[PDB]
């Protein structure tokens, strides 16, 4: 079991997090769906813990069957690649728990995440134990540094550190602009403490996957805050009451993208 903590700073509120996080992530699904894989959403309601804590619950299937590496892909029956999502979203709490059908219990990649109003400052924000907490790497993603970002993944269209907010005029970030979040009035910040637990209990692949998928994640968060503050403009003036209305057509979207189109988004490597 491999843990790690990716803090990703953002020239955004914590509220207006709430919205672009909804935003990008029915984008991002979207352009990754197609030809039978990506994803479907399968639940999406309101919850109600018995401690009070409220939110908002969502199931969904990746299916990632060719958007896998090859030595992925020729380790299981076709179909078994899927894996399933459901995360308990309290903003600005969240739960994620993601598995798997074939590998049982073997498996699971946990993202558990505190946005904070703060500029990732905060140690041990999800309190774990002393000790444990001492073997958990933690990792800072800055979204405007080019050399965090895979050569293949580049899009200049999706790189903040040419990005200007047109309605807000934030933008670009510049090699400073972290210490420079201090020095004005405008652009406000936060930072998402995302603890990713990694669980992939193969006899001897385990090492190797268990820090495989973290690559992954590590990955996913960089290109997906870099295309969140860039199309910072698609979403700032949208209200919660816009996302909801927003998401049931998304998953309508995604199916109807899943059985025509063919496979779109990042191919394997
Ligand atoms: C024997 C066989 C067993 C093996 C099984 C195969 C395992 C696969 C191996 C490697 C894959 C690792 C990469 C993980 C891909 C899944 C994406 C993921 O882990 O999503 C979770 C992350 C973090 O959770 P969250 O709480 O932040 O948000 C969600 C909660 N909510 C909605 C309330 C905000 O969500 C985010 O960052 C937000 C972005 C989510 C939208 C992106 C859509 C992704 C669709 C397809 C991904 C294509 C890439 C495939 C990778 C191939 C490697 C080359």
């Not at 699971?108 to 073997?135: F, R, S, Y």
């Not at 979204?143 to 293949?152: F, G, N, P, T, W």
Request: proline share 4%.
């Amino acid at each position: 079991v491999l843990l790690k903590e990716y803090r990703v700073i953002l020239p955004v509120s914590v509220d207006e997090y709430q919205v672009g996080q909804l935003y990008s992530v029915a984008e991002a699904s979207k352009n990754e769906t197609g030809g039978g894989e990506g994803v479907e959403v399968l639940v999406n309601e309101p919850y109600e813990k018995d401690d009070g804590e409220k939110g908002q619950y969502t199931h969904k299937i990746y299916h990632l069957q060719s958007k896998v590496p090859t030595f992925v892909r020729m380790l299981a029956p076709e179909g078994a690649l899927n894996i399933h999502e459901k995360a308990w979203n309290a903003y600005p709490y969240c739960r994620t728990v993601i598995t798997n059908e074939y590998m049982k219990e073997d498996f699971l990649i946990k993202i558990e995440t505190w946005h904070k109003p703060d500029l990732g400052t905060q140690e041990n924000v999800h309190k774990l134990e002393p000790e444990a907490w001492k073997h958990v790497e933690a990792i800072y993603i800055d979204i405007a540094d080019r050399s965090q970002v895979l050569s293949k993944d580049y899009k200049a269209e999706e790189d903040p550190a040419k990005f200007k907010s047109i309605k807000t005029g934030r933008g670009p970030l510049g090699p400073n602009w972290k210490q420079e979040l201090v020095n004005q009035k405008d652009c406000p910040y936060m930072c998402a403490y995302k603890l990713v637990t990694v669980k992939f209990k193969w006899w001897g692949l385990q090492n190797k996957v268990e820090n495989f998928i973290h690559k992954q994640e590590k990955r996913l968060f960089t290109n997906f805050h870099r295309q969140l503050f860039c199309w910072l403009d698609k979403w700032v003036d949208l209200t919660m009451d816009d996302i909801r209305r927003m998401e049931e057509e998304t998953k309508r979207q995604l199916d109807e993208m899943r059985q025509k189109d063919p496979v779109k988004g990042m191919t394997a490597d």
